[PDB]
Amino acid sequence: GPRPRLWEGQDVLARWTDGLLYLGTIKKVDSAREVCLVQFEDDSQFLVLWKDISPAALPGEELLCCVCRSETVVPGNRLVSCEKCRHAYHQDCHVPRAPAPSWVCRQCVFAIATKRGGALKKGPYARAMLGMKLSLPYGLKGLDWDAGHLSNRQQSYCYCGGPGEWNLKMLQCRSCLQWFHEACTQCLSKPLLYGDRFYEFECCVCRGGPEKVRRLQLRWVDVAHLVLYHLSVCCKKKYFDFDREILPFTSENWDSLLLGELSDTPKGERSSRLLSALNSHKDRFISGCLFGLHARMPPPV
Ligand SMILES: [Zn+2]
Ligand SMILES: [Zn+2]
Ligand SMILES: [Zn+2]
Ligand SMILES: [Zn+2]
């Protein structure tokens, strides 16, 4: 082709595994694997799939659909322009179908409403976000999953269609088994722990409406395993000091752990039950006053 969509030196927004957009520069284009090497603002460089890369709208493209690259229009399928990014779309190249020709496209609604800890809950963008989330921008049936239904080949997740790691602040839907980004959800009261599957969750698409979520009751062994796994992933190490790291994390984040029945236990006893859990389950925990996990996987539900 004579006019690639992407090229070296191009400034782009890349969607990361948290569903959020990061400013970057293309350093290498791999047309075979359809990835680019992108350098981000902290100078880190990662491969990013073409589907997750958005360059800026350029002068001269005002009449071009940014999806199918055509200016041609027919009666029931007009061009609509986004007020925020200034890209244009055929009504039918947008998901969901865009209204007849002020309007904001799906990517911009997500860019405005997604937030670490959970998306905006209130206001016009929260409602627009909810409306976008009734539909997926990829086919669920066509995905190829590994045995545990944890990752797919396409790297298509969530309402956004971005990449993702199931153990890194994502929730799985009961009904479709797809995984969804914390940042793209609107139902959480607290940010997710890494690897935390102690929820019942049903997505907007399956419900045809707002998400539904329930935090399951944890046992003390679950608390210990969750905290230790979360720390392992956060800190990228194996062994943690109980007094300098484990217990302080648990104390300082107590209300955010959503511990249900356990949340009322006397403050002077919490250390005892936590440490007892760590000492008693040798199948889960390696002891050193340090503790680590065997083979580093999230707590089983
Ligand atoms: Zn997402
Ligand atoms: Zn189009
Ligand atoms: Zn837009
Ligand atoms: Zn679902």
Side-chain angles (χ1 to χ4, degrees), residues 1 18 20 33 44 59 69 81 91 107 111 119 123 126 138 141 155 176 178 183 193 221 241 253 258 263 268 299:
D18 54 10
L20 303 174
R33 290 187 290 170
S44 70
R69 313 191 74 182
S81 297
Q91 297 176 260
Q107 273 241 40
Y138 57 87
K141 280 338 188 32
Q155 305 193 223
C176 64
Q178 175 59 289
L193 295 160
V221 62
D241 180 28
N253 298 281
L258 297 180
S263 55

Side-chain angles (χ1 to χ4, degrees), residues 175-194:
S175 301
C176 64
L177 298 169
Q178 175 59 289
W179 292 85
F180 295 81
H181 296 117
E182 176 198 79
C184 298
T185 65
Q186 290 162 290
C187 60
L188 300 175
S189 68
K190 302 283 183 177
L192 302 175
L193 295 160
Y194 289 131

Side-chain angles (χ1 to χ4, degrees), residues 114-167:
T114 53
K115 293 286 172 295
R116 295 183 182 82
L120 298 178
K121 299 179 184 296
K122 288 291 296 154
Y125 278 102
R127 307 308 304 174
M129 172 83 161
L130 173 51
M132 296 297 172
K133 285 161 60 172
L134 303 175
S135 300
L136 299 179
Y138 57 87
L140 256 190
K141 280 338 188 32
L143 301 179
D144 296 307
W145 291 91
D146 61 11
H149 207 108
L150 303 176
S151 67
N152 62 75
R153 247 285 185 191
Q154 290 76 8
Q155 305 193 223
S156 289
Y157 300 96
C158 192
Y159 310 103
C160 59
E165 295 190 64
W166 65 274
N167 53 311

Side-chain angles (χ1 to χ4, degrees), residues 65 67-68 90 93:
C65 176
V67 172
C68 70
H90 287 111
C93 285

Side-chain angles (χ1 to χ4, degrees), residues 228-291:
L228 206 47
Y229 181 78
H230 181 83
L231 285 175
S232 297
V233 176
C234 264
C235 303
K236 308 194 189 69
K237 63 182 179 189
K238 180 172 185 171
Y239 293 102
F240 295 85
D241 180 28
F242 182 75
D243 307 284
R244 287 169 189 83
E245 295 174 299
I246 305 295
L247 186 58
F249 177 88
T250 299
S251 168
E252 308 177 2
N253 298 281
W254 185 261
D255 289 332
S256 302
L257 303 180
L258 297 180
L259 297 178
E261 306 180 52
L262 310 181
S263 55
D264 63 11
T265 189
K267 77 205 147 153
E269 295 185 332
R270 300 177 174 179
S271 178
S272 167
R273 280 266 206 141
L274 193 61
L275 175 123
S276 175
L278 290 166
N279 284 327
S280 303
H281 299 80
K282 291 301 184 185
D283 58 313
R284 304 187 183 229
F285 312 121
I286 305 178
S287 195
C289 196
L290 314 172
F291 291 97

Side-chain angles (χ1 to χ4, degrees), residues 173 175-177 180 202-203 205-206:
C173 176
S175 301
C176 64
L177 298 169
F180 295 81
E202 197 171 28
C203 76
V205 184
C206 287

